[PDB]
Amino acid sequence: KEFAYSEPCLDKEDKKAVLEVLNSKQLTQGKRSLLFEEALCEFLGVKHALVFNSATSALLTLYRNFSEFSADRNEIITTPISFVATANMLLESGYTPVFAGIKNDGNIDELALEKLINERTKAIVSVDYAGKSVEVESVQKLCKKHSLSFLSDSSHALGSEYQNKKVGGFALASVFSFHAIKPITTAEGGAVVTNDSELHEKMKLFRSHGMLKKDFFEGEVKSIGHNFRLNEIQSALGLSQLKKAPFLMQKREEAALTYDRIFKDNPYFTPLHPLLKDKSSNHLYPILMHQKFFTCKKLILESLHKRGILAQVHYKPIYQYQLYQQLFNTAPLKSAEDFYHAEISLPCHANLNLESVQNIAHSVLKTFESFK
């Protein structure tokens, strides 16, 4: 009885909505992506939404279009505790990533950003790690104080709130992901949401060949564009999943709460969930091992896998990859290293019932006792 760390959660209505699209003659560039984009705007309380084939494609369109590029303003500060894509797309946009420290919770350290700004600094890119909001008030005030763009990678955090308001409209722009195992899914897919109308329209054309309507037969191209559209089949699934996002988020919060209960005051590791101040998407359920276990990681992990718990680790500090060590040869950050050595993401998704969570939790405990 094997448990992936996350799974898609599709139901009858989701399937019904996909079938409906298979019966029509518009498979792409149609009503359903617009409908999906409108429903996100409503859901998040923002003005503008664009859906893409992936969040990685959405990150790129944002990075390329928030402002024009200047070799004099070429550094962007971001976290090294993110999926590599957050960084890879900076490089594809011509920026140099500058890596900040993080906190116990895995989020970018709002205190340690000051130290790192210089003349080259163009933006801060934050990540709502595990779906937990970063300290928005701070980064905003800092970004204003320094004429910096605030960009939010909120891939994990569709549904998450900060001071009882849903993440999405705190930054110049925010990226979400609808990858298979994310809070809601379109199989693959992402979005950029924004309150700036000019940004929206500019990254709308980047998304689709830079084609402006004209004759009906003829169009105009003033700038480059790709084909990063999200098709109608995946838009229908998105609509359908969105309509139940608060229910799905609550099923995960329930899993989190069962874990907390059973894990309370254990001698082995610190779960992050009880430390939440606002509502979270609960994309991941992280535990942070105590130092004594660091040299056991792999053995701890293999021992979990053998019990059917396919635990993962989020994330390897980005600067540690070969690509980043060749380009920047970055000096390690202790906040990053410690978190990486400590973090384990346990199974957490909407489809896990009480029994499975109980079994998994008790079983995690047996694993750590196995050592000492």
Add this chain to the structure above:
Amino acid sequence: KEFAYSEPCLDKEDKKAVLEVLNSKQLTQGKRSLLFEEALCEFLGVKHALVFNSATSALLTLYRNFSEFSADRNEIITTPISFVATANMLLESGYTPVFAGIKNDGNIDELALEKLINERTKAIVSVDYAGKSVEVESVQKLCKKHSLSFLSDSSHALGSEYQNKKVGGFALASVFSFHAIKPITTAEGGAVVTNDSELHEKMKLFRSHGMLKKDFFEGEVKSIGHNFRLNEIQSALGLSQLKKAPFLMQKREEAALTYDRIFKDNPYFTPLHPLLKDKSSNHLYPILMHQKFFTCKKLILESLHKRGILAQVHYKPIYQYQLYQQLFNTAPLKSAEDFYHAEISLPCHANLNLESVQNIAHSVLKTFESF
């Protein structure tokens, strides 16, 4: 009724294939894209196939990866008669397009190509117009001679043939589209096929974050990559569609033959379909107006639309786009400007029955008669 120039043609097994995926816990990065890639290899007779979210992503991926970029060899020759993405992706790859001349069959003229090869030339990019294969054997030589890469944008041409051999394994790599209205669809999708194993592996990495699998928990990244994966839902549809690609192509062929019959010896335009010498995918059915009609295109098309025929023109020559003026200022080519004014694409797709074709054809003639 209202006739769009092309449509998807899905059936009950297409619909059944998609449901099997929704019932599964694997919606992306799964068996089915591998299977679809495999089935594309078997269909084409090539060693490697990679599927992407769109043909534009496949192009960028090929363009960025077929060789390392050098400011010295920064010129790639291509046709101006192609969808824009063909060039937008050259710009994004830092190359400069050199627009060649076209034949009146819409294809890049394989003779006006030597004139253009200089010191900074890296590759030739042909487009298989309307599914018609370019003069492959003649391009393979001009590229072998001048040490250039041959890259084929065969977007429209899955199923097409050259000297009774499937288009796909003639170039260094070939790109196909599975967009909603292409020979087969995955709604949105594309592919790069190749017989070059090193290039396959490199493009595979570019398609997915550059992530190399180490053990279960860790990987390595040595070069950037994106997220241009095709998911399991569309792969499943791809497979179901590919299995009937020959049937669908033969429906489009029959529709073209009907047009051909009704249009025989007409005094208004010349259709391209009868001119073929090899099997084509028939992605479009192009007709070329006689010179004396160029002057009224706007009114001829509006009255075609008026009768319900949603005809289209492929293509506005790429250099005419504001963007390409600002950059290269390109002086018009006589062959491409002509073809542009002459061309109208009539509806052509697998679901267009005999009555419909016989009606559209009749309406087309009536519209030209009234001028």
